[PDB]
Structure 1
Amino acid sequence: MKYILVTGGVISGIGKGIIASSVGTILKSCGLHVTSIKIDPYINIDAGTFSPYEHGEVFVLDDGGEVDLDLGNYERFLDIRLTKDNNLTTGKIYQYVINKERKGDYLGKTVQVVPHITDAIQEWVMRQALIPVDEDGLEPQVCVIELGGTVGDIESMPFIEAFRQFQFKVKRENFCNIHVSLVPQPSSTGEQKTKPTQNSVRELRGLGLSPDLVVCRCSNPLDTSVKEKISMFCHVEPEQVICVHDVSSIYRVPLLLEEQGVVDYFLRRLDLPIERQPRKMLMKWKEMADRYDRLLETCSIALVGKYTKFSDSYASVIKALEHSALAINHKLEIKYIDSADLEPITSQEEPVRYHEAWQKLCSAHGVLVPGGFGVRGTEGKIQAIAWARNQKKPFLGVCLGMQLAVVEFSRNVLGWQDANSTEFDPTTSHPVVVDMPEHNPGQMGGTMRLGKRRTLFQTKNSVMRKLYGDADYLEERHRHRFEVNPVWKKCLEEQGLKFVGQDVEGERMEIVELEDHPFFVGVQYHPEFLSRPIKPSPPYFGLLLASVGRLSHYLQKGC
């Protein structure tokens, strides 16, 4: 097992996972069984408890793992399947060791970071090193380890030691130190600064680790003299000084790395053979790059929500949209409309924003009301929903959005204006949205429905079914707790609000398709987790097609 450790300093968000994913797919192209471990210094356990605004999506793994999106990124770049084993936290380690302490596995003796924790860490490395993450049940040939934190963080120091020694328990050629750093560049001077890197690297080498390659997050490319300075300061080859300038899109990075020839370095460094044609794929990334460079019209989508204030909370969602944009080869605008700005409260506060938001909403080609948390903006959200329904604008609701859509329907079609979600109003005359958690044995209380679950189609006459390919069933990511009250579903069955998808029990509703509407659907499950550039998920692709006014032709053409 090659152990490529990805470290970094100066600031989070430097792009360690970006490089990791880029190299990972490169190594897969090379023909290696690539696996990876994300080590989160985190004291806590279970990313699923973290806020999506605070951090972003919690990628759901096949095993219902609630992990960081970067692992989903890895699953975008590599077909590999990851499990909870692939994401460790110190909280996890704590409980683990503490348990063993209670067990007397340490003879009741105190355990210390060294040797005991660092040993456990190394054990973990092997525990996952030995797990194949492919159909090929073979110990992967290379493991890329995203070590979170930055150099200097106490949270990561235990691992610095673990790895410091570890790299010597394994052979030199079986361990690679990648260090990502930052070349900041003030706008006031435009001078590319290396000192921060010098600081990080110096500290790292103080710690005892010495990068084999140093990735430099650069704005624009570095000039020679800078590279030469770095070379001297770090005592590394200018080859090893890797400038990765900012790219308009991530897809350019693998190509950049190719330009850099980092692969050849790895071949020499890790002593790896390679059979090749162009060194690596090439037409894969090359064609896509050509397509990315050669795009028509910009289709805009109104992201309506709370956490919608720009953040990367929707990075995989937009990426899913990008998958569709690439397929169709059109350009994509993401509008960020705070649903709150759609409310009359805003009209009262700043009607500029109020009317601006609605102006933007109308100017959008399609709308998306994703899931979210909090009562905030519910009104504006529903207003947007009703607007789209009335205006026959392509509407996709996800989770909360679907839930609210049903409520909206009840209110403005069944006249049940007091229909509501029990999530926010326990005194609801028509409890449309009701808390329906899972009650598995061994659990105290209910639990949120989460994981890859099977959804069954209730009918053949379903647009989504057609988009899926006439499948009898589909399996999707789930993450949601409230469900349709069947007490009112039955009052919605004579209505043109048709429920198409159901859980296996036939109880929880997963897909709804409003009849007599160019495109108005809602899903509970989360397809953006499974959408891939090659196989885009269909509710976003279909939404795009509707946003364009292509969809009917598409299906007519042959789907």
Structure 2
Amino acid sequence: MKYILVTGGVISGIGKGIIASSIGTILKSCGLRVTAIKIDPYINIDAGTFSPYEHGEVFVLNDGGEVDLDLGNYERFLDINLYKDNNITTGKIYQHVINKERRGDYLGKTVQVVPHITDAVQEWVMNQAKVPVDGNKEEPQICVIELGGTIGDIEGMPFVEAFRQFQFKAKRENFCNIHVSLVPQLSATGEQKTKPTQNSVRALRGLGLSPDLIVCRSSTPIEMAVKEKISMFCHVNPEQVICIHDVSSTYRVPVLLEEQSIVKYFKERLHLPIGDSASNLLFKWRNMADRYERLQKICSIALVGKYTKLRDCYASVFKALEHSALAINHKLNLMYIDSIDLEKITETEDPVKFHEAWQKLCKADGILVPGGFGIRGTLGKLQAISWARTKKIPFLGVCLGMQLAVIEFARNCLNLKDADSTEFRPNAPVPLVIDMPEHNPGNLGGTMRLGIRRTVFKTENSILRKLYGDVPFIEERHRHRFEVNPNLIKQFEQNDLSFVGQDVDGDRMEIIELANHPYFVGVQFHPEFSSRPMKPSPPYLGLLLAATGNLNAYLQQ
């Protein structure tokens, strides 16, 4: 199978992941079938033990992975559904080899980092390239590999040795190489320098790889004498020094690389069966990148969250949301409100943090409550859901918002004010949200409801059955532990809020739809991760179709 290894150059925050995924979008739209194996230098096996603030935004796969943020970038720029071993971290090999040396699967033999780690990386990438990562069951054709972290650092050393020997496991005509590099410049001088691109490739050749492409990233597009300079010091023709300047969007990055004629390069370098025509489906990525800059209308919806800033921590949500806003022709102004700032605590001790966050909630024409774990920042979002019910703003709750809306509906329309969850003050007077972990035969104890499960509708007049396309069942990614108590359906028999979503065996309720309000829905699943920039996530479309008035006319065609 053909292999494309991107690898970093001078510094860290270049944009490997937008380069590596945009090599995917080209060869996805050339007809070829693409996988993606993002290498990670960090140690976190089954990575989602993080704090989303740090790191950012634990991503969820179909099988139940707790996988890196930047693996979500492949499942949008392609329609790929990745697997939990289709990520690979440093502490995933070292756990895989320590588990093999204690079984005795090496027969003594004094296991080493060469070759017994570098074989374990190469056995990994020979296998996860083969698994059909599209829904179409067929062996794939290329494999973009993203070696995270820079080079010359001391986590590249187990991996660039592993891909040093991997040039010759495959043939020369099966293994390309991308080296994304920083080409800085100073302001008042204008000279666009490229010393560190020289000293990074010299560090790269000493590690055993030579760049086939050298993707220089700058502020302005690099001069034609600059790429003539890199051609002499980095052993490649000047047609292969691709620039990528300060792009105004991520959607322009695939159409920018195509005009740099990379499609013609991978035709001869990897001998791929592209063909020679209009070189991709330019009619999708450019046809929306023209729409992304042509945005002058505003659907400024709010997003109350547990965290102080958008150091990303909701990248996924943000992304789904735009995906809707690209299909409605609206520049989305995401007002990020901290949930702590709306509490009763804040107005006593610090009114400026209080009122400035509330003022954003008043001007907003959509509240989104995403997922989250813990008592922290909970009591603020309970004020915001009451602001959606008593002032008629479109609302969407995701995996905690569905839980907290059903809690506050009992507090404010049923006056069951003592009802709470069991995550929150666990010895519950009225146990409305209880714990109910899963029991799948094959593990021990209470497992999280995690992965693709089935969700069955109940009624016919569902505003989500209108959006998903009148289908009986949907499949979305779950990540939680808790449910609404089935012994509180008795208190929910006739009033405004009712249940629409339900799983297979019926013990757990999924989707709510409040009456006499254009949009008040809450989901147990995460609608984010099934979105693409082609098809929006259907709950996120209805949150923006109701945030601009088009929710009426959308449901008349």
Partner of 1:417: 417
Q: Distance in 2 between matches of 1:456 and 1:250?
A: 36
2:333 match: secondary structure: strand
Tell me by how many angstroms 1:289 deviates. Answer: 2.1
1:437 aligns with 2:437: yes
Tell me by how many angstroms 1:90 deviates. Answer: 2.9
Partner of 1:149: 149
Q: Distance in 2 between matches of 1:129 and 1:463?
A: 40
- 1:411 maps to a residue whose letter is R
Q: Residues 20-68 of structure 1: CA distance to partner in whole angstroms, max 9, x if unpaired?
A: 1111121122222222212222322112222222223333222222222
1:487 aligns with 2:487: yes
Partner of 1:513: 513
1:432 match: secondary structure: strand
Partner of 2:30: 30
Q: Distance in 1 between matches of 2:395 and 2:135?
A: 38
Partner of 2:110: 110
Tell me by how many angstroms 1:240 deviates. Answer: 2.4
CA RMSD in angstroms, aligned pairs only: 2.0
Flag the 1:190–1:393 CA change in 2: closer, same or farther, 3 A.
farther
Q: Residues 232-291 of structure 1: CA distance to partner in whole angstroms, max 9, x if unpaired?
A: 443433322221112121110111101111121112222334323211122112211222
- 2:240 maps to a residue whose letter is Q
Q: Is the 8 A contact 1:320 1:531 kept in 2?
A: yes
Please identify, of 387-396 and 348-357, the stretch whose mean Cα deviation from structure 2 is larger.
Answer: 348-357
Please identify, of 496-505 and 369-378, the stretch whose mean Cα deviation from structure 2 is larger.
Answer: 369-378
Q: Distance in 2 between matches of 1:490 and 1:398?
A: 24
Q: Is the 8 A contact 1:371 1:400 kept in 2?
A: yes
Tell me by how many angstroms 1:501 deviates. Answer: 0.6
1:549 aligns with 2:549: yes
Please identify, of 136-145 and 324-333, the stretch whose mean Cα deviation from structure 2 is larger.
Answer: 136-145
Q: Is the 8 A contact 2:230 2:241 kept in 1?
A: yes
Tell me by how many angstroms 1:308 deviates. Answer: 5.8
Flag the 1:442–1:141 CA change in 2: closer, same or farther, 3 A.
closer
Please identify, of 100-109 and 114-123, the stretch whose mean Cα deviation from structure 2 is larger.
Answer: 100-109
- 1:173-322 aligned at under 5 Å gives the runs 173-185=173-185, 192-307=192-307, 309-322=309-322
Q: Distance in 1 between matches of 2:457 and 2:104?
A: 52
Partner of 1:455: 455
Q: Distance in 2 between matches of 1:370 and 1:82?
A: 23
Please identify, of 509-518 and 89-98, the stretch whose mean Cα deviation from structure 2 is larger.
Answer: 89-98
Q: Matched residues, percent identical? A: 76
Q: Distance in 2 between matches of 1:500 and 1:384?
A: 23
Q: Is the 8 A contact 2:79 2:532 kept in 1?
A: no
- 1:255 maps to a residue whose letter is V
Q: Distance in 2 between matches of 1:95 and 1:192?
A: 44
1:176 match: secondary structure: strand
Q: Residues 415-450 of structure 1: CA distance to partner in whole angstroms, max 9, x if unpaired?
A: 222322221212332222211111233433211111
- 2:259 maps to a residue whose letter is E
Relative to total residues, which structure has the larger helix share, 1 or 2? 1
Partner of 2:475: 475
Q: Distance in 1 between matches of 2:545 and 2:360?
A: 20
Q: Residues 386-431 of structure 1: CA distance to partner in whole angstroms, max 9, x if unpaired?
A: 0111001001111111111111111122222232222121233222
- 1:67-146 aligned at under 5 Å gives the runs 67-146=67-146
- 2:460 maps to a residue whose letter is K
Q: Is the 8 A contact 1:215 1:243 kept in 2?
A: yes
Q: Residues 449-497 of structure 1: CA distance to partner in whole angstroms, max 9, x if unpaired?
A: 1100001112112111111122211111111111102222321223211
Residue ranges of structure 2 left out of the alignment (5+ in a row): none
1:49 match: secondary structure: coil
Q: Distance in 2 between matches of 1:514 and 1:138?
A: 44
Q: Is the 8 A contact 1:61 1:67 kept in 2?
A: yes
Tell me by how many angstroms 1:294 deviates. Answer: 2.6
Tell me by how many angstroms 1:296 deviates. Answer: 4.6
Q: Is the 8 A contact 1:307 1:372 kept in 2?
A: no
Q: Residues 66-88 of structure 1: CA distance to partner in whole angstroms, max 9, x if unpaired?
A: 22233332222223332223112
- 1:221 maps to a residue whose letter is P
Flag the 1:413–1:138 CA change in 2: closer, same or farther, 3 A.
closer
Q: Is the 8 A contact 1:420 1:432 kept in 2?
A: yes
Q: Distance in 1 between matches of 2:444 and 2:301?
A: 41
Flag the 1:368–1:186 CA change in 2: closer, same or farther, 3 A.
farther
Residue ranges of structure 1 left out of the alignment (5+ in a row): none
TM-score by length of 2: 0.95
- 1:348 maps to a residue whose letter is T
Q: Distance in 2 between matches of 1:464 and 1:273?
A: 42
Tell me by how many angstroms 1:535 deviates. Answer: 1.8
Q: Distance in 1 between matches of 2:352 and 2:236?
A: 56
Q: Distance in 2 between matches of 1:215 and 1:139?
A: 29
Tell me by how many angstroms 1:127 deviates. Answer: 1.3
Flag the 1:273–1:515 CA change in 2: closer, same or farther, 3 A.
closer
Please identify, of 116-125 and 233-242, the stretch whose mean Cα deviation from structure 2 is larger.
Answer: 233-242
Q: Distance in 2 between matches of 1:188 and 1:62?
A: 51
Q: Distance in 2 between matches of 1:193 and 1:373?
A: 48
Partner of 1:52: 52
2:536 match: secondary structure: coil
1:268 match: secondary structure: helix
